[PDB]
Design a protein around this nucleic acid. Structure first.
Lengths: 100, 50, 50, 99, 175
DNA sequence: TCATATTATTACGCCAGACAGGG
DNA sequence: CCCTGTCTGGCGTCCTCTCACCTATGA
């Protein structure tokens, strides 16, 4: 399947996601450090060993991703900064999310 | 594609102990080769030497 | 190598081996179906040059 | 078109399966036909419950085999293959058939 | 008397080379110096077949056969036809015609194109067939059943665990 | 999408090493 | 047959950093 830019992201907690909005993209103005998350991005994994819970979770939300593989964009290790401008370009047909 | 330049039954599996067809993945089940794709479930380092 | 654009800009070796295997398979088929000898001379010249 | 015949003894389970397969279809492809319920087979059985003799003493059992007919009108590249990895819950015999 | 010669074209533009060659003949009106032009024949698709459609038939590997005579004017004519490399022979001064003793045996083989042939084949369950047509294309499986009376090999998508048993034609799937 | 298979520029500077030509 | 122009191949500095750009065809 395609990828996800949304902020419902595995393996992360409050301390990473406090600097993102409700749709993955960092704010305009958030002064970040070297190694935070700017854009949250997760790619498909798979069910493989679909267990009773895994099979029940693949028919309750109606989504098949599920845990996903973190591939979020990060600030390269060493540089600080202040996010001044965010561009979002969308290939036509794709659902625009709330920040686009 | 079997059996072109990049192969699996000539040169070995792409993933370690990961048979192309997939049937052997036990620690007490090593040495036996595959029957479907006939890929000896071994290591991918052997695609550097065959 | 992938170039992260859906395509593989291949290395030169796979291109060369692919040319040898194309020309060799066409020469096996032309020696199979009894081609006239001028054409299989030309085909062997092409294989030698590949 | 891909006709899909779900068969199971538990009806709730079969329902769950059907919904699952619909979900599978609908994200990848488009225009899923729908989950059509066919008639249930109520295969009954009578048996003598006594060791030796009492013929009016009986237990009547039955097995309710439920049928669910799901159809897919447009088989795309992505959709059909999606089912390969997508196995359904145990105790539900599925039967896909394209054309 | 017009003898045969072999022309090399850019492989893939061969029908367009043949058409441009006929047109250059009827432009420079050396009509008495060219007989025919033979291209991509002896079709067979893949295996067997008794219906139409199918297509994807090709034997000519890039060579164009020309009934011709040899003057240097006609030689310059054929090499001035576009997308033509040159003749294939012993030398480039006097290029080589092919034969005539192997034309008698080739004539009998061309007359038996469709009269009485099509030899039978066989198959077995192992290890697995290949599907390249319909939604099952790009998938492999095994033939649990092989109806030789209906010419239909029963092969299941064989999904890791429990797949579904479908029927594919011999040409629809590959061994 | 899945096999088909190669043509219309020149403008370095020695320095060895092999080759046909000729007194 | 021993000089000889002439032609063909084979060299030509290490280390690092930034950027862009990547085969056509096709019933």
């Amino acid at each position: 399947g395609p990828e996800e830019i949304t902020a419902d992201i595995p393996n992360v907690g409050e301390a990473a996601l406090s600097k993102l909005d409700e749709s993955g993209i960092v704010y305009i103005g958030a002064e970040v450090t070297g190694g935070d998350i700017l854009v949250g991005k997760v790619t498909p994994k798979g069910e493989t060993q679909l267990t009773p819970e895994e099979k029940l979770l693949r028919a309750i939300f109606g989504e098949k991703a599920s845990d996903v593989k973190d591939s979020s964009l990060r600030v390269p290790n060493g540089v600080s900064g202040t996010v001044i401008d965010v561009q979002v370009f969308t290939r036509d047909g794709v659902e625009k999310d709330k920040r686009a | 594609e079997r059996d072109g330049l990049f192969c699996a039954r000539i040169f070995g599996p792409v993933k370690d102990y990961e048979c192309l067809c997939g049937k052997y993945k036990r620690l007490k089940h090593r040495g036996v080769i595959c029957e479907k794709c006939g890929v000896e479930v071994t290591q991918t380092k052997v695609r550097r030497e065959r | 190598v992938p170039l992260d654009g859906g395509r593989f800009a291949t290395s030169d070796l796979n291109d060369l081996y692919r040319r040898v295997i194309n020309r060799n398979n066409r020469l096996k088929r032309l020696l199979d179906l009894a081609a006239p000898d001028i054409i299989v001379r030309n085909e062997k010249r092409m294989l030698q040059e590949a | 078109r891909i006709r899909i015949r779900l068969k199971a003894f538990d009806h709730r389970l079969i329902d769950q399966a059907t919904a699952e397969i619909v979900e599978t279809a609908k994200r990848t492809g488009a225009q899923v036909r729908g989950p059509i319920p066919l008639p249930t087979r109520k295969e009954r059985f009578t048996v003598l419950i006594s060791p030796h003799v009492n013929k009016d003493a009986r237990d009547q059992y039955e097995i309710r085999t439920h049928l669910r007919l799901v159809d897919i009108v447009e088989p795309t590249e992505k959709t059909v293959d999606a089912l390969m990895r997508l196995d359904l819950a145990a105790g539900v015999d599925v039967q896909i058939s394209l054309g | 008397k017009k003898r045969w010669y072999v022309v090399q074209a850019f492989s893939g533009f061969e029908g367009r080379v043949a058409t441009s060659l006929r047109e250059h003949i009827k432009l420079h009106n050396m009509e008495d110096l060219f007989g025919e032009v033979m291209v991509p024949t002896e079709e067979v698709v893949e295996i067997r077949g008794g219906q139409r459609r199918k297509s994807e038939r090709k034997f000519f590997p890039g060579y164009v056969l020309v009934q011709m005579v040899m003057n240097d004017a006609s030689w310059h004519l054929v090499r001035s036809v576009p997308r033509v490399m040159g003749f294939i022979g012993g030398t480039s001064d006097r290029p080589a015609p092919i034969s005539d003793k192997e034309v008698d045996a080739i004539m009998n083989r061309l007359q038996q194109v469709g009269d009485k042939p099509r030899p039978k084949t066989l198959f077995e369950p192992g290890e697995m067939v290949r599907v390249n047509d319909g939604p099952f294309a790009d998938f492999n499986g095994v033939v649990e059943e092989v109806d030789y009376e209906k010419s239909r090999l029963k092969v299941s998508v064989s999904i890791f665990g429990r797949a579904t048993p479908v029927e594919l034609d011999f040409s629809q799937v590959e061994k």
